[PDB]
Design an enzyme around this catalytic site. Structure first.
Site, PDB file in Angstrom:
ATOM      1  CG  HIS C 167       2.268  -1.229  -8.635  1.00  0.00           C
ATOM      2  ND1 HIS C 167       1.549  -0.283  -7.940  1.00  0.00           N
ATOM      3  CD2 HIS C 167       3.339  -0.586  -9.153  1.00  0.00           C
ATOM      4  CE1 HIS C 167       2.165   0.881  -8.024  1.00  0.00           C
ATOM      5  NE2 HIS C 167       3.252   0.725  -8.756  1.00  0.00           N
TER       6      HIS C 167
HETATM    7 ZN    ZN Z   1       6.996   3.031 -10.684  1.00  0.00          ZN
END
Ligand code: ZN
EC number: 3.5.1.98
Lengths: 40, 48, 656
Positions: C167
């Site tokens: 992320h």
């Molecule tokens: Zn995840």
């Protein structure tokens, strides 16, 4: 004949332990082994 | 090197025992079937 | 005795080796700082109590020789321990900005309240004083893992490694991610070996969209990125536009980026099987990679209260088996997601079993027939992919770009009627063997064969009414390119079984047809027409019949509003007894009671409605609709041929 006598003595043997797992010779390729019994 | 760097001199207590691994494919081999007695059957050269 | 072939070594490369493994007890110190008691009844969105469970359950099935669960060397005969090293700053700097590294170098030596302000400040992350080196350890360790893969010291590698790294952006961090994990390692192998590795395919089955590594290679060609996640444009995390299904790379990275988006939460295994056997295997073979990498996240498994899906670990086995089949054998698997420990334990067990070499087990169920939103999703994917890729062309018959600006509506005055045709043929073969009377109807502008009547209807005691629109049309697309063949299409009659079952028991049988009006989303004016003709036929004919008792009605599809309005605006419950309707998929029919109010309860009593399994409800109806029933299939034909016996038994239960 020799295989039959070998599997006899390797099974339940008589009184002493003088001469007396993978590979699963004992029918254990488990795919519908227990499941082919009705289990109910 | 690390700042984490665990520091305890003591024998760790045993957690699990070592057993036979519960797999059933490939510590084994591959079966082969062959015999020269299939090479008995040949053709009768008839035409020429 | 004569030798002909000598003895030598087996000239193989795969499986005299082992599976490389990366694990250390040094990645379990970076932890949250306590704020509120909600974290006691919260799923703890990244806990350090994951990786030791995986290591323990790997020891539990004889795949790891360690009785004491510590980082050792004597791993056994099937797996090889890979030594772990923290990355240098240069390798992180190969993808990350310098100021990000300065930010983490600030965060390593902050105070307590500064750390609390930073935890609240960022986007869904947290920090600690022991965060720097514990962020320095994963990716370099991952850099070790692929280094054992490309250099061929092991068969394949599994690096059970936390914190996740899919992320974080090169600019900033996000979503409990500190650095990248897979992008930095991919960059390191591409920079370090531009001789043996030329194309890398990366897959993501974390249920959250891997935005960071998507951004890190959004304009490159040597990385093919494919992710799978739920979209839900605004709500579900992260819910940005970069996770949309039309984001197809950019620049020279066009045609190297692929999103797969689930419309609704609650998918199962066969969605994943269908998506892989449809899509990712031809694209992976077309890409011809040199190395595949998996960013795994088991958050989409069954028994998880975050994603709420139903992926049994056997599905994971079939996944990694086909992915092993994709490349020549080189493979590395890291871990990103996970919330429930038992599911990720069983998942890790199955993926380790396959990564050693064992065949994946069977599916717990192969008969699931997945949800149609995934089907329409994969059509909308394969359109744009047939634009960019080539193997999808002419197999799904997209035939190049083919983005169709026609379906223009200007010559709509000149059109085939097509409804009088179907109803006329239907009237033809119905009258040919049944000799039904075409009963007329004055004072309305309707076609002649709108109502068809059983001969000698005046003497008939038990009369049943069937109401239907024009029956359905199944067509065939020509598979080579594009269009639809109209000549190879079929009319599917739907009422005729009910009609025949009524006829062979000597009942009065009356049929009405209601055509659909053109270019209308709902057939509202058709509902008006049905109300008109139903009130008309009830007034003109049924009130005057001498021998009449035990009337029933057969509702099909739409136009149930005619029977609902007939029940409402009159009262006829003394002579009729039981209505039935197979709605299918249209909007429901509320009943307005005018003559009485116990008529509502009587309508609830002897009535059954049958709807789709994928209707807009069931995501409990009010009693003003009258005992609807959720069947388990789709399409009107399937539910008719499914519950025909139950409905006809109910009709026979209604009478004596
Ligand atoms: Zn995840």
């Amino acid at each position: 004949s020799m295989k039959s006598l070998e599997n006899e003595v390797n099974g339940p043997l008589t009184k002493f332990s003088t001469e007396s797992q993978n590979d699963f010779q004992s029918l254990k390729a488990r795919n519908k082994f227990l499941k082919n019994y009705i289990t109910l | 090197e690390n700042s984490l760097s665990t520091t305890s001199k003591s024998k760790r207590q045993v957690i699990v025992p070592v057993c036979m691994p519960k797999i059933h494919y490939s510590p084994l081999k591959t079966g082969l079937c062959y015999d020269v007695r299939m090479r008995y059957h040949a053709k009768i050269f008839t035409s020429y | 005795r004569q030798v002909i072939v000598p003895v030598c070594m087996p000239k193989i490369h795969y499986s005299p080796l082992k599976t490389g493994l990366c694990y250390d007890v040094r990645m379990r110190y970076h932890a949250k700082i306590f704020t509120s008691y909600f974290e006691y009844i919260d799923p703890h969105p990244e806990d350090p109590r994951r990786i030791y469970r995986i290591y323990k359950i790997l020891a539990e099935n004889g795949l790891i020789n360690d009785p004491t669960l510590s980082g050792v060397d004597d791993l056994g005969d099937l797996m090889l321990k890979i030594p772990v090293r923290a990355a240098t700053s240069e390798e992180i700097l190969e993808v990350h900005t310098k100021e990000h590294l300065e930010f983490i170098e600030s965060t390593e030596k902050m105070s307590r309240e500064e750390l609390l302000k930073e935890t609240e400040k960022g986007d869904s992350v947290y920090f600690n004083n022991d965060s720097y080196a514990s962020a320095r350890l994963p990716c370099g360790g991952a850099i070790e893992a692929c280094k054992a893969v490309v250099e061929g010291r092991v068969k394949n590698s599994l690096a059970v490694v936390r914190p996740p790294g899919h992320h974080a952006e090169p600019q900033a961090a996000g979503g409990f991610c500190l650095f990248s994990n897979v992008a930095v390692a991919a960059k390191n192998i591409l920079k370090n070996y531009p001789e043996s590795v030329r194309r890398i395919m990366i897959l993501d089955w974390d249920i959250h969209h891997g935005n960071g590594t998507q951004k890190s290679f959004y304009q490159d060609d040597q990385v093919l990125y494919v992710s799978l996640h739920r979209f839900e444009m605004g709500k579900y995390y992260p819910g940005t536009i970069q996770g949309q299904y039309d984001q197809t790379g950019e620049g020279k990275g066009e045609g190297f980026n692929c999103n797969i988006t689930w419309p609704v939460g609650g998918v199962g295994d066969a969605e994943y099987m269908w998506a892989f056997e449809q899509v990712v295997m031809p694209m992976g073979r077309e890409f011809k990679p040199d190395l595949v990498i998996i960013s795994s996240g088991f958050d989409a498994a069954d028994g998880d209260t975050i994603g709420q899906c139903h992926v049994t670990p056997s599905c994971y086995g079939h996944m990694t088996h086909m992915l092993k089949s994709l490349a020549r054998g080189n493979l590395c698997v890291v871990l990103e997601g996970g919330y429930n420990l038992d599911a990720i334990a069983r998942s890790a067990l199955s993926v380790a079993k396959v990564l050693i070499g064992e065949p994946p087990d069977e599916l717990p169920d192969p008969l699931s027939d997945p949800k149609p939103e995934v089907i329409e999703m994969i059509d909308k994917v394969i359109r744009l992919q047939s634009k960019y890729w080539n193997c999808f062309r002419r197999r799904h018959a997209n035939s190049g770009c083919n983005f169709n600006e026609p379906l223009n509506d200007s010559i709509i005055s000149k059109n085939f009627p097509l409804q009088k045709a179907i109803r006329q043929q239907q009237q033809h073969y119905l009258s040919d063997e049944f000799n039904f009377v075409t009963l007329p109807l004055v004072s309305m502008d309707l076609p002649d064969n709108t109502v068809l009547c059983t001969p000698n209807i005046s003497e008939s005691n038990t009369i049943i009414i069937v109401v239907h629109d024009t029956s359905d049309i199944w067509a065939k697309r020509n598979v080579i390119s594009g269009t639809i063949d109209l000549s190879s299409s079929v009319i599917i009659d739907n009422s005729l079984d009910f009609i025949k079952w009524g006829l062979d028991r000597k009942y009065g049988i009356i049929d009405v047809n209601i055509p659909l009006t053109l270019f209308e989303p709902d057939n509202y004016s058709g509902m008006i027409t049905s109300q008109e003709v139903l009130i008309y036929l009830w007034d003109n004919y049924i009130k005057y019949f001498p021998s009449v008792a035990k009337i029933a009605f057969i509702g099909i599809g739409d136009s149930y509003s005619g029977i609902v309005h007939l029940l409402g605006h009159r009262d006829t419950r003394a002579v009729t007894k039981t209505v039935i309707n197979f709605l299918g998929d249209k909007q429901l029919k509320p009943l307005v009671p005018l003559v009485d109010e116990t008529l509502s309860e009587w309508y609830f009593k002897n009535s059954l409605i049958f709807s789709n399994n994928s209707h807009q409800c069931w995501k409990k109806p009010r009693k003003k609709f009258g005992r609807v029933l959720r069947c388990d299939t789709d399409g009107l034909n399937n539910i008719i041929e499914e519950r025909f016996e139950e409905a006809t038994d109910f009709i026979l239960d209604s009478f004596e």
